[PDB]
Each structure stands twice: as structure tokens, then as C-alpha cells.
Amino acid sequence: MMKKIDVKILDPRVGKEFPLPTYATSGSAGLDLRACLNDAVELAPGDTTLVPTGLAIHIADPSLAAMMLPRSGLGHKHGIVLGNLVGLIDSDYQGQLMISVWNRGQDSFTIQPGERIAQMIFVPVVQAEFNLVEDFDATR
Amino acid sequence: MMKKIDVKILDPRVGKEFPLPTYATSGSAGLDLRACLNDAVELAPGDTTLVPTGLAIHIADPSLAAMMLPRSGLGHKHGIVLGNLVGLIDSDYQGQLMISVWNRGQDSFTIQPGERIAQMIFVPVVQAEFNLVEDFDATR
Amino acid sequence: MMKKIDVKILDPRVGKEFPLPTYATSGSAGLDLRACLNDAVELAPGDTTLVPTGLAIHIADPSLAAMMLPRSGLGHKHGIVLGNLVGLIDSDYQGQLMISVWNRGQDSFTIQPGERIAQMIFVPVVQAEFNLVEDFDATR
Ligand SMILES: O=c1ccn([C@H]2C[C@H](O)[C@@H](COP(=O)(O)O)O2)c(=O)[nH]1
């Protein structure tokens, strides 16, 4: 499935100095999100900092959501992940996408302006309606 | 996609003192899960505790799963996340939903009865059948 | 949805000494991935190690991805999770699946050859095309 998603550029560097998120290849699942910062931010081991992206999206379709994930190299090699682990973006959220960057490792890390700091996937989601029962059907 | 899901209330406070999970808005991707506790649990930095929800679900449809995620504010601001990071709920699981709460930060945290401690999304899943090959087709 | 996925066995122990990933039940969302190692690896608290699986997959379909997640018991009980938290596998990735194993807890852990160290789910993904707008439609 392909989907057009409205995006608002909140910082005029986004799409210029800080490239807009793109899929690296036709078979890529995620887009990389970049740090929209004026200056580098040093992130000490154990600390968390909130990094703006300079953009907002409006998924709009309640059958879709986005999930923000760490980048594999940053996470594995540098211990730079998300403070909320996975960031869930609701279809009706229209605010700036913000990235909770957490240093889970032992080495201080410099977050540079424009650095790819997270990735984002769009996944279908199902809205559950709970049906209260006394007993389930037989299943395991 | 909308789906009705059977749920069993295991603790009679759930749906009363501890509200049943709901979608906050029509465009929300996730439902918040609450701590079904008799008394507050203090969670020291670095520690993990298993928190009951007082409910069980039976997704039943093998094309669907649920994923439990940290809440964004708890994770980012308080360092309160999941000890298994993401909790995968199988379609044929009928046990109580349990939340592994892990304090990944530096500040002790009081988990209160009724506190929203995680969120849960329902996502379609695909069951893979592996086809063993010597070589892949050309792709990157 | 069911999907056949091409897999290449890179280490001849995979499918023999190290069982190929399987769904435990018909309603299971994920498959367990095993450590393809010659000898046990001791993982001290706070440390990360890259563990091979001895296999490669080629999802091929750009409407599908895989996500690697911690196992619930390892994560909750032993503090053994993923260093990148969640591992996203692109449809056009044809390399060996590698698992970033991170000890987020306080107890040293022995990763044994053949140990189930992660699980993997296949989820539909949507490739977003951004549509730049000045203002969103009314939504929350
Ligand atoms: O890592 C994150 C997680 C969430 N959000 C945005 C998208 C969500 O729809 C919105 C509301 O989050 P909650 O307050 O409901 O958790 O915050 C982010 O920008 N980054």
C-alpha cells in the first residue's frame, strides 16, 4: 500500500539544509528523521533530550499509524535510542514530530544538526472494540 | 479496519475504579493500559516489576496481534518503560495481560493503582512460511 | 494474511543443531530467532554484542516488513533485550539477520549457542509520499 500524507514544514531548514525524510530504496520500510537543531547537543550516558524534527504530519486516516524506532547503527554501536523506546504517532496528531533521544550506553554522544536520529514506519492499525465476556472460546 | 475483541475482566475494579482501556480520540492508534494494583509500587532506578492489568483479551484472529508500548510521557520524562521494550500479544493468548515496567532512568517512581502505564496497538500480522533457496532474486 | 518468504541458510547448523524459526502455535504472531554461535558469549550488564542468526531472508514485497523484538521472558526476567530496541528488516534486505543483544539489567548473562534470543514479526507497511501543505484540514 502507498499513501499520500500531508506534511507541514515548521522550520525552513527542513527540505534544504536538513533534508526531508526519504526512503533510501524502493523496498525500504522506514524513513529517517533528522535532528532539527541550531547547534550540536551533547548527550551524556543515561540522559535523554527532546529533539525537534521541524515538521508535522497529518496521517488523517484512522486505519494508519506511524511508529518511530531507533536507527540500527546508532542503537547498536552508539547506544543512542529513544527514551520512550518506540514513538507512536496517531492519525489525528498534527503537532511537530519530536524525538526523545536517550543515551542507553556508556559513551557521551554529540547529536549534530541534520543527523539521522530515528526512523519512522507507517503501519496499518486496527481500532478494537471490546466485547465483555465471561468465558472465551476454546484455543493453546 | 475495526475489530471486536473478546475481553474478560479478571479484577472487578476494571471498568469501575480502574477504567477500561479506551481510545482517547477517533484517530488514536492505541489504548492505554492501567495498573491493577492494591497499593502503589515504588520502582527504583534500574528495577523492573510485573504489573497486572486485571484483564485478558482474546484477539482470536491469527491475522492480528497487539503490541504493548511505553507511554510517551512516562518514557521520555520519567524513564518508565517496558522491561521487554515491546510486548507482543499473540492472537491465541488468553491469559491476563501483564506489563513489565522498567525504570530506565535515574529517579525512583511510584506506580499508582489505576495509573496509565502502557499503551496497546492492534496491528495486522503476516505468518511467514519459509521457502529455502540457494540464491535470492536480484535486488540494493 | 500468509506469505511465503525466501530464506537462505548461511550456516549449515541452521535447520539442524539450531532449529529454523517456527511459529509455536497457529495463532502465534512471531517466530523466535536463535543465536548462531560456536561458543557461549557472556554478556555483562550494560554491554551489547552482535549475534548472528545464520540466515538471511528476502521479504521482497515492499508492502511488508519484519520487526525484531525482545523475547518477553529474557527481557523481563533477565534484562536481555535488543540494543537497537526494535530491529526493522526492509523488504529488500538480503543480508544475514543480525541481532543486537543488549544487557539492560544488573546480572551477567550467558548467551548460549541455539538460544532463542529475539522474536520476529511480519507486518504490513505503507510507503508514505509526503504532500507539502501550508495548513492541515481540521482535526483533536
Ligand atoms: O516519540 C513520540 C511519540 C509521540 N509523539 C506525538 C505523536 C502522538 O500522537 C502525540 C501524542 O502522544 P501522547 O501524549 O498521546 O503519548 O505525540 C511524538 O511526536 N514523538
Ligand SMILES: O=c1ccn([C@H]2C[C@H](O)[C@@H](COP(=O)(O)O)O2)c(=O)[nH]1
Ligand atoms: O509484555 C507482555 C508480553 C507478552 N504477554 C503475553 C502475551 C503473549 O502472547 C504471551 C506469551 O508470551 P511468550 O511467553 O511467548 O513470550 O504473554 C504479556 O502479557 N505482556
Ligand SMILES: O=c1ccn([C@H]2C[C@H](O)[C@@H](COP(=O)(O)O)O2)c(=O)[nH]1
Ligand atoms: O536489528 C537489526 C536491524 C536491521 N538489520 C538489517 C535489516 C535492515 O534492512 C538492514 C539495514 O539496516 P539499516 O543500516 O538501514 O539500519 O539491516 C538486522 O539484521 N538486524
